[PDB]
């Protein structure tokens, strides 16, 4: 999976792919949580003293869930205030998960924490404050709902003003938070290795050179996708473009850097890692594009289109898009 | 520009991009030539003793023309028999253009030859026979209509059974002909260098290794796009996919290997080379997808849709697609 934030004159744009091995194909769904919903956490957090068993939705939230391999875990969310939260795989955190220390805050199962954040908070700084004040914690050491083992993930929050927070579990089980804006290197997030190692790798490349991407090794790995996203986003020029053209330019640039095709094997894993679906957001205006790489089809919609709903709703959005749907058919949850 | 042929259970699929420097952006148009049309060649062929001044359309043909830099030259065509012809840049032929020897055949201006071939012939073998019998030749040494200088292009013919011919002007002005099917390396064609040099380059890579694309240097040049298309198409696995999924699979695999993003400079040229538009064809059923990378938008249609036209017709297809058209508006030529 790869994620790119790009400041544009029409809004803060975010693009993200969901990638996995071909032997456990992804299946993207979406849920709508309206303001006032009484929410019950999925799963357990038995490793933690206190659980975020129940909460109320404060901000209208659309949550993209992965049903094919992650049991319905919420991996990409947005809310009516333009906050976006996301979880991406971070395999280098796996040995450290059981070392996360319970800080006594109510722990949120990793199936729900991404959505929880958007449901409760409006800005990146708010989320940082809530973490620091102990209003919640990520249940790092607990299996996601319905799964056997704690998942190696990393998290980030991007707000409508381009403030970014990266949350990563590092050696010894420590939680490292990185902050930056949408012009910083935190605009790009992929998978392993950990962010320090990406930064180390990147020192060899002069991003000012417009030919720099041609000097970078290619692979399907997180390392190479991070480097190439940073290179190609640095020389993206959005001046003079219409909104459609700006959206497309981010899409095409992102795809060249980061779309993973089927069939290529990573020698570091002995497995493939194709992209299954992707989302693009304008955090300033509610625009969303969901694209399935299984069908090559995409639909555009807007979060505001879902405020009509007074109780939670659900759609098998990837399936629908794959059958050629042009509009989402919502079901009561 | 890059072109990939892929055999599938649903038909012979062909995908091609049109790439150029961002200082002279492409603008694709399309012309339709119905059966029985009395055609008049565009431009002159004064370097040759006999001109293909006139011909008759035998096979219903759709011709994609490049109007932004190439004066309206026909660069990608298809007919009602499932024959596809195409011209792609081949800068390494430039030194040899004026050395092509006139064999006395009626010579076709390079603005039209691609369309001419689809309009006369049904199969790759037929075109090779026509060349060998002197029915026509390509006017290699003559400027395309409306342009100052002979253009450095190479041509290929791909028929509905997957037979491929590459026609490439090499040392001494020799017209070199390469034959193979859609499982040969000729299924991939890009730009410079010449085909023998791509083949030499490729000897270092074992395409049977599923990790081989990870071992290949990346750049925007023809060399690296040929290599990557060969690698990624080797491990493309179309088993069990639906038609939609198969089309998407070729598209995604092709894009990963060969879509050229804006902003990246080739150190070999000091220039960029972004993809402006692409075409996908099912040669067995007439399906056509035209995608603009400037808008990100695409239209699907079928050659059959144009079979009712009783006079030649034209459409500014890229312009229409970029404005959000869902169907093509045609005008009389
Ligand atoms: C909705 C996104 C998927 C959620 C599961 C993941 O974390 C996998 C990833 O894409 O890295
Ligand atoms: C219709 C496609 C464009 C025709 C002009 C070219 O031959 C250039 C290329 O893409 O290399």
């Amino acid at each position: 999976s790869s994620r790119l934030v790009t400041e544009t004159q029409y809004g803060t744009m975010l693009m993200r792919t969901a990638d996995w091995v071909s032997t456990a194909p992804f299946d993207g769904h979406m849920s709508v949580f309206p303001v006032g919903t009484e929410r019950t956490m999925r799963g357990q957090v038995a490793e933690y003293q206190q659980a975020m068993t129940k909460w109320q939705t404060k901000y209208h939230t659309l949550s993209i869930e992965e049903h094919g391999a992650f049991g319905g875990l919420s991996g990409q969310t947005s809310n009516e205030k333009g906050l976006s939260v996301m979880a991406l795989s971070q395999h280098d955190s796996e040995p450290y998960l059981s070392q996360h220390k319970d800080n006594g805050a109510p722990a949120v199962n990793t199936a729900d924490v991404v959505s929880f954040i958007t449901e409760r908070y409006a800005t990146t700084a708010e989320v940082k404050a809530a973490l620091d004040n102990g209003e919640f914690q990520i249940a790092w050491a607990s299996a996601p709902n319905g799964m056997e083992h704690a998942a190696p993930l990393h998290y980030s929050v991007v707000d409508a003003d381009g403030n970014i927070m990266l949350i990563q579990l590092v050696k010894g089980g420590e939680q490292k938070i990185y902050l930056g804006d949408a012009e910083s290197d935190l605009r790009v997030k992929t998978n392993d290795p950990l962010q320090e190692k990406h930064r180390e790798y990147m020192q060899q490349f002069d991003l000012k050179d417009p030919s720099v991407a041609t000097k970078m090794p290619w692979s399907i790995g997180g390392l190479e996708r991070n480097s190439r996203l940073l290179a190609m986003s640095t020389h993206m020029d959005l001046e003079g473009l219409s909104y459609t053209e700006t959206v497309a330019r981010q899409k095409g640039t992102f795809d060249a850097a980061a779309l993973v095709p089927f069939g290529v094997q990573d020698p570091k894993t002995g497995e493939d890692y194709p992209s299954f679906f992707s989302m693009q957001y304008n955090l300033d205006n509610g625009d969303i594009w969901f694209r399935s790489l299984m069908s090559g089809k995409e639909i555009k919609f807007n979060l505001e289109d879902t405020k009509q709903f007074k109780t939670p709703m659900h759609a098998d959005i990837m399936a629908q898009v794959d059958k050629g749907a042009q509009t989402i058919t919502w079901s009561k949850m």
Side-chain angles (χ1 to χ4, degrees), chain A:
Chain A
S1 47
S2 311
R3 183 267 294 147
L4 181 69
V5 182
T6 308
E7 288 289 26
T8 84
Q9 67 186 314
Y10 303 114
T12 306
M13 296 297 304
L14 188 151
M15 177 149 190
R16 180 263 173 94
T17 35
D19 313 332
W20 200 234
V21 295
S22 66
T23 50
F26 279 1
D27 175 30
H29 290 222
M30 53 196 292
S31 292
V32 179
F33 300 112
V35 176
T37 303
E38 296 212 302
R39 299 277 282 117
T40 297
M41 200 182 75
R42 292 182 295 178
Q44 284 183 239
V45 293
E47 297 74 1
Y48 294 85
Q49 187 180 61
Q50 191 178 182
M52 183 79 69
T53 305
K54 281 187 183 189
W55 67 90
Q56 296 266 302
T57 301
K58 182 176 180 170
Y59 299 116
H60 184 96
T61 288
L62 288 181
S63 171
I64 299 181
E65 295 170 359
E66 198 312 284
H67 290 238
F70 283 82
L73 178 139
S74 172
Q76 190 80 42
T77 60
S78 63
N79 76 16
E80 62 179 318
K81 306 296 282 183
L83 191 69
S84 187
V85 187
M86 62 232 79
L88 275 70
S89 283
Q90 179 44 276
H91 186 74
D92 281 356
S93 300
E94 186 151 61
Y96 315 136
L97 301 170
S98 60
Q99 307 172 237
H100 176 244
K101 335 108 133 50
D102 179 2
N103 77 358
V108 192
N109 188 271
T110 57
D112 289 342
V113 69
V114 174
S115 192
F116 171 83
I117 294 168
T118 24
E119 289 170 60
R120 294 302 308 164
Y121 307 107
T123 72
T124 302
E126 277 179 19
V127 182
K128 177 55 152 63
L131 283 168
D132 291 345
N133 287 319
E135 301 186 1
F136 82 98
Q137 66 183 319
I138 299 159
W140 292 95
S142 306
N145 175 61
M147 320 266 71
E148 204 191 333
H149 300 300
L153 301 164
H154 59 176
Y155 303 84
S156 56
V157 180
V158 178
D159 76 16
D161 284 346
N163 298 296
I164 299 181
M165 170 170 60
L166 169 68
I167 314 164
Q168 200 165 78
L169 207 77
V170 304
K171 191 193 169 73
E174 293 185 75
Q175 180 178 267
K176 182 81 56 143
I177 300 168
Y178 300 83
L179 304 169
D181 70 19
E183 302 186 337
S184 78
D185 60 7
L186 295 175
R187 77 189 181 281
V188 174
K189 194 178 73 175
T190 62
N191 309 119
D192 66 285
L194 293 165
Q195 184 68 23
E196 292 301 311
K197 296 286 192 142
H198 289 275
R199 286 179 167 179
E200 289 176 14
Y201 182 70
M202 289 305 298
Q203 309 279 357
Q204 76 194 287
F205 298 112
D206 186 358
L207 303 176
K208 296 183 146 180
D209 173 11
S211 75
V212 74
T214 74
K215 298 167 192 179
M216 292 178 163
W218 183 88
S219 187
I220 67 172
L223 186 78
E224 296 81 359
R225 286 183 280 105
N226 177 264
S227 68
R228 288 170 44 87
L229 281 164
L230 288 165
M232 290 187 186
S233 66
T234 292
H235 297 289
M236 169 166 61
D237 187 353
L238 304 178
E239 228 210 36
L241 302 185
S242 70
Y243 179 45
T244 294
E245 288 171 334
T246 298
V247 178
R249 188 61 54 83
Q250 185 195 49
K251 178 183 181 178
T253 308
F254 176 103
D255 282 353
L259 188 79
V260 183
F262 289 82
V264 175
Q265 189 165 113
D266 186 343
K268 296 174 172 166
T269 69
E271 301 182 286
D272 56 21
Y273 211 66
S275 300
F276 284 98
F277 61 90
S278 70
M279 281 77 78
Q280 267 193 289
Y281 293 83
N282 182 340
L283 303 177
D284 290 81
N285 81 359
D287 286 343
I288 310 176
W289 292 260
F290 185 93
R291 167 179 63 174
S292 174
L293 290 310
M294 291 295 305
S295 63
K297 293 181 198 267
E298 173 182 277
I299 59 161
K300 179 201 174 304
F301 57 103
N302 189 288
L303 185 149
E304 182 69 22
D305 295 340
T306 67
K307 285 184 160 179
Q308 60 184 298
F309 301 114
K310 306 300 185 44
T311 62
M313 311 298 298
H314 191 80
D316 53 331
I317 189 173
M318 183 176 173
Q320 293 183 26
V321 164
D322 284 351
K323 292 170 160 106
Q326 297 304 289
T327 54
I328 301 169
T329 52
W330 291 112
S331 295
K332 288 196 67 178
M333 187 71 77

